[PDB]
Amino acid sequence: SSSLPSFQLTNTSTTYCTSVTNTGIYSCLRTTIQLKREFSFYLLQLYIPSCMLVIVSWVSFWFDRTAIPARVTLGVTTLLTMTAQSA
Amino acid sequence: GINSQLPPVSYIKAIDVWIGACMTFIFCALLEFALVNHIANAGTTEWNDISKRVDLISRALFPVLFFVFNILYWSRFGH
Ligand SMILES: CC[C@H](C)[C@H]1O[C@]2(CC[C@@H]1C)C[C@@H]1C[C@@H](C/C=C(\C)[C@@H](O[C@H]3C[C@H](OC)[C@@H](O[C@H]4C[C@H](OC)[C@@H](O)[C@H](C)O4)[C@H](C)O3)[C@@H](C)/C=C/C=C3\CO[C@@H]4[C@H](O)C(C)=C[C@@H](C(=O)O1)[C@]34O)O2
Numbered sequence: 545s546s547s548l549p550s551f552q553l554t555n556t557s558t559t560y561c562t563s564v565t566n567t568g569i570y571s572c573l574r575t576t577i578q579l580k581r582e583f584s585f586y587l588l589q590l591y592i593p594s595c596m597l598v599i600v601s602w603v604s605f606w607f608d609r610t611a612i613p614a615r616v617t618l619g620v621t622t623l624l625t626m627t628a629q630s631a
Numbered sequence: 632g633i634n635s636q637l638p639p640v641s642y643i644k645a646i647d648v649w650i651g652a653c654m655t656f657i658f659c660a661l662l663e664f665a666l667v668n669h670i671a672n673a674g675t676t677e678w679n680d681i682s683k684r685v686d687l688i689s690r691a692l693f694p695v696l697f698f699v700f701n702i703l704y705w706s707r708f709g710h
């Protein structure tokens with residue numbers, strides 16, 4: 545588990561997968577591990593920064609309606625950045 | 632850039648604390664702009680000179696606070 549940083553090996557199972565083929569019936573075992581993806585990374589690199597990005601687009605609701613250049617600059621930069629992040 | 636060369640982990644790295652903090656200092660800068668600009672256009676001169684006062688304080692408070700941060704940060708992770 546220490547050499548597996550990105551996931552968490554939650555469960556394992558030991559089963560049989562014997563099958564009937566055209567050349568005959570072959571005996572077969574199957575072990576299965578269950579990998580849960582670590583969330584801390586996606587919290588910090590995806591969710592947090594997107595909220596921080598959406599929240600910025602709101603601070604333009606507090607600029608006077610006369611200074612539209614400021615509003616567009618915010619709304620557009622946050623939208624563009626949003627794209628990049630997703631890419 | 633930095634985060635792309637790293638594997639996703641389950642803990643918070645000291646690199647995260649540092650990017651996150653600087654991120655805030657810039658976020659609060661924007662916030663200040665809105666606060667200043669908003670109470671600025673308000674008709675009464677009561678808010679107007681307050682608007683001016685917020686800048687004067689920011690011009691010093693931000694640097695001081697950021698310097699304070701560095702001190703805490705480096706003593707915590709440079710050890
Ligand atoms: C607070 C979010 C809002 C949107 C604020 O965002 C900003 C400013 C604007 C808002 C006020 C910007 C944001 C940082 C935050 C400030 C956050 C910190 C200084 C640190 O985190 C805090 C909160 C965190 O808990 C959310 C908490 O962890 C606890 C609770 C968790 O459980 C909920 C649990 O899992 C965990 C184990 O223990 C932590 C101890 O402390 C710091 C860790 C944050 C770093 C953020 C980033 C680092 O690189 C990321 C990337 O490069 C990017 C593009 C944006 C950055 C960012 O998003 O920057 C980034 O994602 O402020």
Ligand SMILES: *[C@@H]1O[C@H](CO)[C@@H](O)[C@H](O)[C@H]1NC(C)=O
Binds near residue numbers: 554555578
């Ligand atoms: C792991 O955990 C749960 C609990 O028993 C179970 O439902 C699941 O099938 C298991 N997965 C694997 C791959 O063994």
Ligand SMILES: CCCCCCCCCCC
Binds near residue numbers: 687690691694
């Ligand atoms: C009384 C106002 C003093 C303002 C000084 C601002 C200095 C900022 C330096 C940041 C490196």
Ligand SMILES: CCCCCCCC
Binds near residue numbers: 655656660696700
């Ligand atoms: C660790 C967060 C520090 C944020 C300081 C913001 C000052 C404007």
Ligand SMILES: [Cl-]
């Ligand atoms: Cl631009």
